[PDB]
C-alpha cells in the first residue's frame, strides 16, 4: 500500500539524519546478508571493498569517523524493485566534520524485513563521491 | 551470458554497427 | 547443488553495462529489448516545471521514451561500475561516468541499475530498473 | 574488425527472419549488381535461371508465393573472401506455407555496401533444395 | 576492351570441379596446390565435442589437414554445380553430390567454393575458399 | 585455363593415374 516513494523518502530522512545525530548506530540499518560497498580509498591509502553484515559494518562506519556529518539531498528517485522491494538513488552534498562539501551519489536497495509488516532493511549500500 | 531477449552473440554484432541492405 | 560456470556479480554486471552502452551508440533503437514488463525507466530529463522528469513503466512506454531521446552517435565514457548481489538473485549496479548525444557535449551521469533474471533461461537477465540523471540537472 | 562469423551469422538471423516475416522486402538485402539463382523447376515447370538486381530479384521471390515460411537452421560457415567480402554455406529445412519440411543448402557471398562502415549487401545467392 | 576467349565463370566453375575430383581420386597428395595463402578449409569432420570441424587456413596447414584424411581411391558423384561470378573477378561454385572414401558407403556433401585470381597470371585461379559439409555429420 | 600452381595438362596427367618409375 505504501507507495516505493513514500518508502524511499522515508528512509532518506531516517538515514541521513542519523549519520548526522548518532553514526554509531547506522549499522541497525542494514541485516546479517547486507553488503556495503564505500568506494575510494582510505588513507592508509588502502582501496575500497564490500562489507558483509551489521557487525562488520558497525566497525567500517566507526573507521570512517563520522562528526556532525551534514547531508544536501539534491535528488532521490526510488522505484518499486521485485519482490517488495524498493531500489533508492540519492544524488547529494556531504560534509563530515565541517569540511568542505563533496558530491556523492549513494545507491540503496531495501528488502522487507519479513516478519513485521513494512519493516525494511538495507540489503544493498553502494556509495561513491563524485570527486 | 546475454541480457533482455537478445539472442547470444546478437547485441555484439549489432554494436559493431553491422546492417545489411537498403531497408 | 554448484554451478562451477556461474557468472559472478561482478562479470553480469560488467558485461551488461558493455552491452548497454556499445548498443546505445550503434543501435540505440534496440535498446528497449534489455528491458521486461514492469520495467521502470528514467533517463534525465526535466519537466514543464523544471523539476526532474518522471519514470515511464513497461516496455512499450519505454521503447517510446528512448525514440523520443534521439540518441545520435552517443558516446559514452564509463568511470565506475561497482555491481553488487541483490536478494532473489538479481544484481544491482552503480555506474559513474559521461555521456555525449550528437557529438555534442559530454554530460556526466550517476545511473543505477537492477538487473533481474528472465525466471528461468539460463544466465539471462533482463534490466527492471533503469535509473538515470545527468548531473547538471541536479548539482 | 567484425569477425566473418559474426557477420554471417548476423546475417542469416536477419535474412530468414525476414523471409518469415515479410518476404515482400526480401530484395532490400541485394543490389544492382547481385545475382539470385534459386535452383529447381517452378510449376510451370520451367528451369530456374539466374535474375539479376534489386527489382527483377523483387518479383522472384514473389513469384514464390512464401507464406509464413520457416526455417530450421542446422550449421552455418562463415569466412572471409577477399575484398572483405564473407561467404557463407546455410545447411537447413524450409517448411512454407506450413508444408512439409525440406533440406536445402544456400550459398551467400556478402559484399561491403562501401559508404557505410560495416553495412554488407547479397552479392550472390545460390539456393538448392536437396530433394 | 574484350578478351573474346575469357573463359565464362560458368566455364570456370565446371572445370575446375572436374579437375579437383579427378584428382582427389588418383592424386590426393596434390590437392593441397589448388589452394593460395590465406585459403580457408573444411572438409567434414566432428570435434571432441561432436560439434562440426573447425577450418584450417593456408597451403600449409590444407595439406596437413588433406593428408590427415587420408583419401584413399576416392570416388565422387557430382549431381550440381552452379558457378556465377563474385566480385573482384572471382568465381563461386556451389557443389552438391556424393563421395565415397576408401570404396566406403557414399557419402552426401554440400560445398562451396570461391576461386580467385591469382593475381595477374592469365586465365589462372586458386581455392580461396572451401568449405565442405557431409550432411550425415549435419542432418 | 588452369588452377592453383598447376602446369597446363598437369592436372589432367596426374588425375590420369600416369606414374613413373619405383618411388
Ligand atoms: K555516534
Ligand atoms: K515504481
Ligand atoms: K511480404
Ligand atoms: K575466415
Known amino acids: ?131 | 551470458l546475454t541480457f533482455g531477449d537478445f539472442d547470444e552473440h546478437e547485441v555484439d554484432a549489432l554494436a559493431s554497427g553491422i546492417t545489411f541492405g537498403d531497408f
Chains 1, 4 share one sequence.
Open chain 1, 1 to 131: 500500500k505504501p507507495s516505493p516513494l513514500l518508502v524511499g523518502r522515508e528512509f532518506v530522512r531516517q538515514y541521513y539524519t542519523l549519520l548526522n545525530q548518532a553514526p554509531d548506530m547506522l549499522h541497525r540499518f542494514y541485516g546479517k546478508n547486507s553488503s556495503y560497498v564505500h568506494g575510494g580509498l582510505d588513507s592508509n591509502g588502502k582501496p575500497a571493498d564490500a562489507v558483509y553484515g551489521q557487525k562488520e559494518i558497525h566497525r567500517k562506519v566507526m573507521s570512517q569517523n563520522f562528526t556532525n556529518c551534514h547531508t544536501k539531498i539534491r535528488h532521490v528517485d526510488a522505484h518499486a524493485t521485485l519482490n517488495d522491494g524498493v531500489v533508492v538513488q540519492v544524488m547529494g552534498l556531504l560534509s563530515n566534520n565541517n569540511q568542505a562539501l563533496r558530491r556523492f551519489m549513494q545507491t540503496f536497495v531495501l528488502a522487507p524485513e519479513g516478519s513485521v509488516a513494512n519493516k525494511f532493511y538495507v540489503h544493498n549500500d553502494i556509495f561513491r563521491y563524485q570527486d
